[PDB]
Design a protein around this nucleic acid. Structure first.
Ligand SMILES: N[C@@H](Cc1c[nH]c2ccccc12)C(=O)O
Ligand SMILES: [K+]
Ligand SMILES: [K+]
Ligand SMILES: [K+]
Ligand SMILES: [K+]
Ligand SMILES: [K+]
Ligand SMILES: [K+]
Ligand SMILES: [K+]
Ligand SMILES: [K+]
Ligand SMILES: [K+]
Ligand SMILES: [K+]
Ligand SMILES: [K+]
Ligand SMILES: [K+]
Ligand SMILES: [K+]
Ligand SMILES: [K+]
Ligand SMILES: [K+]
Ligand SMILES: [K+]
Ligand SMILES: [K+]
Ligand SMILES: [K+]
Ligand SMILES: [K+]
Ligand SMILES: [K+]
Ligand SMILES: [K+]
Ligand SMILES: [K+]
Ligand SMILES: [K+]
Ligand SMILES: [K+]
Ligand SMILES: [K+]
Ligand SMILES: [K+]
Ligand SMILES: [K+]
Ligand SMILES: [K+]
Ligand SMILES: [K+]
Ligand SMILES: [K+]
Ligand SMILES: [K+]
Ligand SMILES: [Mg+2]
Ligand SMILES: [Mg+2]
Ligand SMILES: [Mg+2]
Ligand SMILES: [Mg+2]
Ligand SMILES: [Mg+2]
Ligand SMILES: [Mg+2]
Ligand SMILES: [Mg+2]
Ligand SMILES: [Mg+2]
Ligand SMILES: [Mg+2]
Ligand SMILES: [Mg+2]
Ligand SMILES: [Mg+2]
Ligand SMILES: [Mg+2]
Ligand SMILES: [Mg+2]
Ligand SMILES: [Mg+2]
Ligand SMILES: [Mg+2]
Ligand SMILES: [Mg+2]
Ligand SMILES: [Mg+2]
Ligand SMILES: [Mg+2]
Ligand SMILES: [Mg+2]
Ligand SMILES: [Mg+2]
Ligand SMILES: [Mg+2]
Ligand SMILES: [Mg+2]
Ligand SMILES: [Mg+2]
Ligand SMILES: [Mg+2]
Ligand SMILES: [Mg+2]
Ligand SMILES: [Mg+2]
Ligand SMILES: [Mg+2]
Ligand SMILES: [Mg+2]
Ligand SMILES: [Mg+2]
Ligand SMILES: [Mg+2]
Ligand SMILES: [Mg+2]
Ligand SMILES: [Mg+2]
Ligand SMILES: [Mg+2]
Ligand SMILES: [Mg+2]
Ligand SMILES: [Mg+2]
Ligand SMILES: [Mg+2]
Ligand SMILES: [Mg+2]
Ligand SMILES: [Mg+2]
Ligand SMILES: [Mg+2]
Ligand SMILES: [Mg+2]
Ligand SMILES: [Mg+2]
Ligand SMILES: [Mg+2]
Ligand SMILES: [Mg+2]
Ligand SMILES: [Mg+2]
Ligand SMILES: [Mg+2]
Ligand SMILES: [Mg+2]
Ligand SMILES: [Mg+2]
Ligand SMILES: [Mg+2]
Ligand SMILES: [Mg+2]
Ligand SMILES: [Mg+2]
Ligand SMILES: [Mg+2]
Ligand SMILES: [Mg+2]
Ligand SMILES: [Mg+2]
Ligand SMILES: [Mg+2]
Ligand SMILES: [Mg+2]
Ligand SMILES: [Mg+2]
Ligand SMILES: [Mg+2]
Ligand SMILES: [Mg+2]
Ligand SMILES: [Mg+2]
Ligand SMILES: [Mg+2]
Ligand SMILES: [Mg+2]
Ligand SMILES: [Mg+2]
Ligand SMILES: [Mg+2]
Ligand SMILES: [Mg+2]
Ligand SMILES: [Mg+2]
Lengths: 118, 56, 123, 209, 114, 17
RNA sequence: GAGGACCGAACCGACUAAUGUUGAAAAAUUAGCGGAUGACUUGUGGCUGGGGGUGAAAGGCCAAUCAAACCGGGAGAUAG
RNA sequence: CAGGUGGUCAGGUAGAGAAUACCAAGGCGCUUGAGAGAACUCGGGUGAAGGAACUAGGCAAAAUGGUGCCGUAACUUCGG
RNA sequence: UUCCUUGUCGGGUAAGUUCCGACCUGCACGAAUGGCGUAAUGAUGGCCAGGCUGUCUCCACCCGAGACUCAGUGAAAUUG
RNA sequence: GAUGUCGGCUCAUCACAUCCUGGGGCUGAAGUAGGUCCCAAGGGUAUGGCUGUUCGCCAUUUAAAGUGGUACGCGAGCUGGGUUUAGAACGUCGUGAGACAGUUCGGUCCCUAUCUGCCGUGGGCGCUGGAGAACUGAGGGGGGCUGCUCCUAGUACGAGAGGACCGGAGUGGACGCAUCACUGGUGUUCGGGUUGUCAUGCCAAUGGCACUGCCCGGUAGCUAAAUGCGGAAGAGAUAAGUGCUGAAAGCAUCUAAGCACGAAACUUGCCCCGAGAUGAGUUCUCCCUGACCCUUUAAGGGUCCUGAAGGAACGUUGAAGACGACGACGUUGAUAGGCCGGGUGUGUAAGCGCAGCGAUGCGUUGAGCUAACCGGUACUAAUGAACCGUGAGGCUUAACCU
């Protein structure tokens, strides 16, 4: 049974999941479009979209709290100086997933995840 | 465990009656580009439903 | 939730200090005895000049368990340890003359009105 | 007698003034619309077919829509049937409400139980597990033996083995009726009924005692 | 679940006081020794509180006649006649289950003073 | 070779004396 | 500052259990276990040869082979 | 190819330490991947009340575990 | 070492074919193929207690690696 | 040119020569409790100590702790204590090597399932135009156990001691089904405390690693030890048994003719599956009303035009799920993610200020954060299409209508 449970496990233990989405979240903020497997792009939306509503209100307390979840001051600065104001009026849904072909090496289904006003 | 008699070439082909692949029924045609693609997938140069989503 | 081999303290002053459960009476394949349930015990240690000697086989009635009793509205009463009162083997009447500690209202029955009266506190 | 079709809303408790807590299930019984009546002449048995709920006009097919339009009834979640006793008559289009159970004391509730998936013989059939230790080799929750030697040299039909558990029709019998709430379309019964929240329940007065 | 919520509100008491873990309370409950009702009081330390609407409950611990006793009360039950806070205790926790292994001077809770 | 250790193990092999 | 002393890593072993049993491995791995200045352990070289060697002794070991090694021959032994 | 293989070199913070934990210099992620999140198997974590009732047998697990000081029986070959 | 034999008696347990103490009717002990004791020692055999526990009453949930589906490569025993 | 052994564990299944429960006859049957025989196989039918044990003795239960078959059921299901290899010793026998249904200590248990079987779950085709639903029920399976207390009643019975049948109510044990409101377990996806070390320039604040580092709490879900329900009543035909009327046989006689009772066994009644029930059933609704050519002339083949109802695919997914399947939804939209509000859990964040030599305490402050929950909201993704599916559906006979 798995009833009413949420969260992809992605064939990794918990600490390797926690650290892998922390890298992707930094990479999407910095490049504004990346290419991933479709299961890992749908699980990214629940990590990087809460980071953007956090950045909509600048304070020392929130910056120190976006830092505990990205561990990258070059990412925290972009969130609070560009992606905060840019999505100021949008209420949720800062990200768009687009399916593309299949990865050659192992036939994984691919997708492009980006920020909406890229 | 292992077989006691050699299974024939009819029992082999009956088992493989479910092994066939299914072709894609149709390919959608892009609104502006006019090129085929899988439905719900971007085309081969980044058009999806008219607009150009991947300017690469 | 008393079963065989469970060690119980003694709530009366029969002399015993620790007893072991060796059977849950009242049915075939019966697992557990709760508050108000008669059990067959054996005495594992006694005080030097009591009425009961170590090694005796007697009956007892459970009066406190730390699994607890559930009341009609959903409440629970749990204690810090399991306790029993020693009974005569045939008449099933108390052997001692005092009860220590609180008891509960699941003993309020025609058999154990002797115990209810003696208890310092009934919950 | 006939029953109604409801919907498992949830479970809660009712406190009585004398300090007893009753676990109740809340069944939400809207109006059931009679959409077809069967008779011995045409069908060979007596029954009514009822519908309940609402459905979006987009998802009703042409054959389904034309069956409701004949009765003059607006579409519903599904269609169920109850067998009529002797002396009960119902007419097409009328509505049946939860006040039917006003003086009923006990009910029988049917629903589809929670789906457990492929389950083992320890969960499904209450088999005992074997030793955890003491030398056991890869056989901790496995079934054990499944038959005898050369006589009879086969496994008997109906042997208890692992397979699909749950997700199937179940009936619970002789449940009390703690309260009928006709103004809110509610029916509180005492205890637990099969299915998960939001499932469809069928409620009939108890056939037994 | 507006349907369930409505059924819940009609049964809740409106006068439950505010307490938190560590406090000392009297709970007066109704007992029925045969055919006459009566109140008897339970004194102890609130060691746990469960906030669930009508399903709320709290656990009180006392030492009675040399035996420790825990009682879980359903807050909105009609059996609980009244709850009365006697002392306020300062704790850092939400559930004080470590008080099960402490007796005498080791199981002392300090007053809150505010 | 010859083994198939369970064709050499003589608890398994020498089972009926 | 003695000791076939003590506790304990490297090092040498192999008491228990689980895994593996067409293995990752023709004897291992994991977790614990014993000795650990000595009748210890290890590198390089040397000597003992088949009814023979060597053996704190188990018929143990002598190139994955041991109640008589391996290779070639007698030899196409003989086979109610 | 989860085995075997002699010698030399020997940083920091805690530590008695070449143990153990995290790091430096330096070196690597072990040559199939992507999903899903059934029974069962393997390796682990937690568990109400009871506490060896399990079993051939407390097997296996759990528990104990350090430094300083106080205290320590029978028996003895006078060292334990 | 004792077949008869679970000898009988005592102890320990609610209950003890094992254990400990005795008795002597030693099938079929016995004095360097040594007898009877023995402190310390033993990955030695038997038995009992305390602590501790998923060993068990009686299992439940969770974390990973397989098992399952997709793409790639691709065996084996066995067989009138 | 191999059919693995005793006991244990797991899982059973049949017989009836019946252990309990059910029904009866006789009793050296007053009552309670028995003895013995007949009918009856629906369900039920102990836990421990000792021993390798099956057995047995013993302790304590139970309504009872049945007797057997199944390769003395079951090792391609587990074990490996015993017996039954190689080591060693004792007693005894032998000059000896050695031997012992004498004892004692130690001692490697393989298999990825082709076929039948069984448990689940799909694809194809059929059911005679196509499609969407609701049914009937041939048949098949599941279930079936019982204690104690009270009333009737200290009545019937008996000198007393003792103490009922029949009938009713209540409450339990064991077993099964469901469920998560409660009481709890879990909760490596939530909050906190804390040890060592490394890093973010440093302080403050945080992160990585140490089994989730070690711990303390805990949401949803799953779950039991939690809490609801169940076993029936009734009917039919009976077994053993008991009869009524009644001759053969002037009587008698349950039987020959005729009539009646009679049990947990049987057929129903309760619960689930079920039209591949090829004997392929019924009911309701919806859709299709175009030409032409050819031949070997018939349920024939072909061309153009047409493409319905519906379905599948694809996408967003689920209290559904190994994969299929099943359910919900696809802009005329709450399907999922985010977002907004709440709840819940943790337990008074950071920053700043004040008191203190400092650790630290206090105030702002029940603060900050909060997973799977509840109530909302088109912000993001669920596309205009394309695909499959046709174009009124055979012959004979009958009954009506033209
Ligand atoms: N079974 C084990 C040990 C073993 C090796 N050779 C054997 C010969 C006979 C018996 C056992 C063995 C293995 O395969 O590794
Ligand atoms: K079950
Ligand atoms: K020295
Ligand atoms: K040397
Ligand atoms: K030789
Ligand atoms: K002898
Ligand atoms: K004795
Ligand atoms: K004794
Ligand atoms: K000696
Ligand atoms: K030894
Ligand atoms: K010893
Ligand atoms: K049998
Ligand atoms: K018979
Ligand atoms: K009988
Ligand atoms: K009789
Ligand atoms: K029977
Ligand atoms: K015997
Ligand atoms: K075996
Ligand atoms: K066996
Ligand atoms: K076989
Ligand atoms: K076959
Ligand atoms: K049956
Ligand atoms: K709870
Ligand atoms: K929970
Ligand atoms: K740290
Ligand atoms: K913990
Ligand atoms: K007569
Ligand atoms: K019955
Ligand atoms: K059909
Ligand atoms: K799976
Ligand atoms: K603060
Ligand atoms: K809060
Ligand atoms: Mg993988
Ligand atoms: Mg870690
Ligand atoms: Mg499910
Ligand atoms: Mg299934
Ligand atoms: Mg093995
Ligand atoms: Mg195992
Ligand atoms: Mg046959
Ligand atoms: Mg030494
Ligand atoms: Mg060592
Ligand atoms: Mg060696
Ligand atoms: Mg070893
Ligand atoms: Mg090792
Ligand atoms: Mg040691
Ligand atoms: Mg050492
Ligand atoms: Mg030396
Ligand atoms: Mg030898
Ligand atoms: Mg060779
Ligand atoms: Mg060799
Ligand atoms: Mg020779
Ligand atoms: Mg010759
Ligand atoms: Mg030859
Ligand atoms: Mg290598
Ligand atoms: Mg080395
Ligand atoms: Mg190291
Ligand atoms: Mg480096
Ligand atoms: Mg798993
Ligand atoms: Mg426990
Ligand atoms: Mg806990
Ligand atoms: Mg505990
Ligand atoms: Mg035992
Ligand atoms: Mg046993
Ligand atoms: Mg051990
Ligand atoms: Mg002593
Ligand atoms: Mg000394
Ligand atoms: Mg004795
Ligand atoms: Mg002796
Ligand atoms: Mg001798
Ligand atoms: Mg001699
Ligand atoms: Mg002599
Ligand atoms: Mg001599
Ligand atoms: Mg001696
Ligand atoms: Mg697979
Ligand atoms: Mg493949
Ligand atoms: Mg061959
Ligand atoms: Mg053969
Ligand atoms: Mg018979
Ligand atoms: Mg034993
Ligand atoms: Mg057999
Ligand atoms: Mg077999
Ligand atoms: Mg063994
Ligand atoms: Mg053995
Ligand atoms: Mg020998
Ligand atoms: Mg022999
Ligand atoms: Mg095996
Ligand atoms: Mg097969
Ligand atoms: Mg039927
Ligand atoms: Mg039937
Ligand atoms: Mg809930
Ligand atoms: Mg809890
Ligand atoms: Mg936890
Ligand atoms: Mg700092
Ligand atoms: Mg690091
Ligand atoms: Mg049909
Ligand atoms: Mg899906
Ligand atoms: Mg709306």
């Amino acid at each position: 049974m798995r009833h009413r449970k949420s969260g992809r496990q992605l064939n990794r233990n918990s600490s390797h999941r926690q650290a892998m989405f922390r890298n992707m979240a930094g990479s999407l903020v910095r490049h504004e479009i990346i290419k991933t497997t479709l299961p890992k792009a749908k699980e990214l939306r629940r990590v990087v979209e809460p980071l953007i509503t956090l950045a909509k209100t600048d304070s020392v307390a929130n910056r120190r709290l976006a830092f505990a979840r990205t561990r990258d001051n070059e990412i925290v600065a972009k969130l609070f100086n560009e992606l905060g104001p840019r999505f100021a009026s949008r209420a949720g849904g800062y990200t768009r997933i687009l399916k593309c072909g299949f990865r050659a090496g192992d036939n994984a289904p691919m997708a492009y995840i980006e920020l909406v006003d890229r | 465990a292992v077989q006691q008699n050699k299974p024939t070439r009819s029992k082999r082909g009956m088992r493989r009656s479910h092994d066939a692949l299914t072709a894609v029924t149709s390919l959608s045609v892009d609104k502006t580009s006019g090129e085929k693609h899988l439905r719900h997938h971007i085309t081969a140069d980044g058009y999806y439903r008219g607009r150009k989503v991947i300017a690469k | 939730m008393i079963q065989e081999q469970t060690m119980l303290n003694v709530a009366d002053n029969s002399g015993a200090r620790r007893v072991m459960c060796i059977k849950v009476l009242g049915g075939s394949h019966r697992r557990y005895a709760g508050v108000g349930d008669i059990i067959k015990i054996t005495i594992k240690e006694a005080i030097p000049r009591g009425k009961v000697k170590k090694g005796d086989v007697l009956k007892a009635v459970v009066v406190r368990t730390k699994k607890g009793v559930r009341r009609p509205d959903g409440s629970v009463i749990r204690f810090d340890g399991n306790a029993c009162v020693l009974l005569n083997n045939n008449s099933e009447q108390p052997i001692g003359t005092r009860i220590f500690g609180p008891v509960t209202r699941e003993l309020r029955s025609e058999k154990f009105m002797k115990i209810i009266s003696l208890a310092p506190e009934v919950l | 007698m006939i029953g109604l079709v409801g919907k498992k809303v949830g479970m809660t408790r009712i406190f009585t003034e004398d300090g007893v807590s009753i676990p109740v299930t809340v069944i939400e019984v809207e109006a059931n619309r009679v959409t077809q009546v069967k008779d011995l002449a045409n069908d060979g048995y007596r029954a009514i077919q009822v519908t309940t709920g609402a459905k979006k006009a987009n998802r009703v097919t042409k054959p389904e829509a034309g069956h409701f339009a004949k009765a003059g009834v607006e579409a519903g979640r599904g269609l169920w049937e109850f067998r009529l006793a002797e002396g009960e008559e119902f007419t097409v289009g009328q509505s049946i409400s939860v006040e039917l159970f006003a003086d009923v004391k006990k009910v029988d509730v049917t629903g589809t139980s929670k789906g457990k998936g492929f389950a083992g013989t320890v969960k499904r059939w209450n088999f005992r597990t074997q030793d955890a230790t003491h030398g056991n080799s890869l056989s901790h929750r496995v079934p054990g033996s499944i038959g005898q030697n050369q006589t009879p040299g086969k496994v008997f039909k109906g042997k208890k083995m692992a397979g699909q558990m749950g997700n199937e029709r179940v009936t619970v019998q002789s449940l009390d009726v703690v309260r009928v709430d006709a103004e809110r379309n509610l029916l509180l019964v005492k205890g637990a009924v099969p299915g998960a929240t939001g499932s469809d329940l069928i409620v009939k007065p108890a056939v037994k005692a | 679940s507006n349907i369930i919520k409505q059924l819940e509100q009609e049964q809740m008491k409106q006068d439950v006081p505010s307490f938190r873990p560590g406090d000392t309370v009297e709970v007066k409950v109704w007992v029925v020794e045969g055919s006459k009702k009566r109140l008897q009081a339970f004194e102890g330390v609130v060691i746990a509180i469960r906030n669930r609407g009508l399903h709320s409950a709290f656990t009180v611990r006392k030492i009675s006649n040399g035996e420790g006793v825990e009682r879980v009360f359903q807050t909105h039950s009609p059996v609980v006649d009244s709850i009365s806070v006697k002392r306020r205790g300062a704790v850092r926790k939400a559930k004080l289950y470590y008080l099960r292994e402490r007796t005498g001077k080791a199981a002392r809770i300090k007053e809150r003073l505010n | 070779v010859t083994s198939k250790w369970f064709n050499i193990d003589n608890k398994i092999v020498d089972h009926f004396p």
